[PDB]
Amino acid sequence: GFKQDIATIRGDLRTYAQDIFLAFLNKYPDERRYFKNYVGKSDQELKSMAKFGDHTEKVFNLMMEVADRATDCVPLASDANTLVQMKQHSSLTTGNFEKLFVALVEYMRASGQSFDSQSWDRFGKNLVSALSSAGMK
Numbered sequence: 085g086f087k088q089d090i091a092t093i094r095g096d097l098r099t100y101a102q103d104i105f106l107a108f109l110n111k112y113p114d115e116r117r118y119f120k121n122y123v124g125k126s127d128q129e130l131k132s133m134a135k136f137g138d139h140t141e142k143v144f145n146l147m148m149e150v151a152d153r154a155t156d157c158v159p160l161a162s163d164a165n166t167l168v169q170m171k172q173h174s175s176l177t178t179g180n181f182e183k184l185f186v187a188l189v190e191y192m193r194a195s196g197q198s199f200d201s202q203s204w205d206r207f208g209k210n211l212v213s214a215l216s217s218a219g220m221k
């Protein structure tokens with residue numbers, strides 16, 4: 085279920101984080117504009133860049149913390165507020181977050197694996213509502 089999925093992802097965080105983030109940029113290539121140092125770089129060039137692995141791992145570490153603190157895939161308002169008030173997220177809208185979660189669920193459905201992809205879709209929908217409520221356009 086969702087709790088096991090958090091354990092699965094955490095066990096190999098850097099690989100899942102890189103694979104899901106690339107799946108996101110591949111599905112929505114205009115989103116790469118927010119990551120100016122990743123434009124025009126192949127996947128293997130990205131993996132040679134320290135900050136690509138560091139910043140993907142830390143994004144997914146936080147995502148897993150927010151997922152773990154949720155009740156029945158409903159995140160804490162405090163965690164939504166953290167994501168809205170981050171300087172790095174100042175120009176984002178809830179649509180950016182929805183795209184990441186559409187890509188994450190598509191990755192889980194395409195994987196070998198028994199992810200609870202309905203729960204990740206729900207968690208994403210609930211996190212979008214919490215982000216709006218915390219003031220994200």
Ligand code: HEM
Nearest residue numbers: 115118119138139142143144146147172173176180181184
């Ligand atoms: C639940 C979803 C997300 C979480 C948990 C999250 C978390 C984070 C974290 C922890 C950082 C700082 C990483 C570090 O300094 O090492 C970060 C930076 C950033 N995030 Fe997010 N983020 C999320 C979604 C998004 C989305 C949807 C976008 C844009 C489409 C975005 C754009 C960025 C950008 C541009 C940075 C700074 C890039 C950099 O300096 O490397 N994030 N995010």
Ligand SMILES: Oc1ccc(Cl)cc1Cl
Nearest residue numbers: 105136139140141143184
């Ligand atoms: O390194 C990252 C991976 C995913 C997302 Cl959404 C943002 C950042 Cl900075």
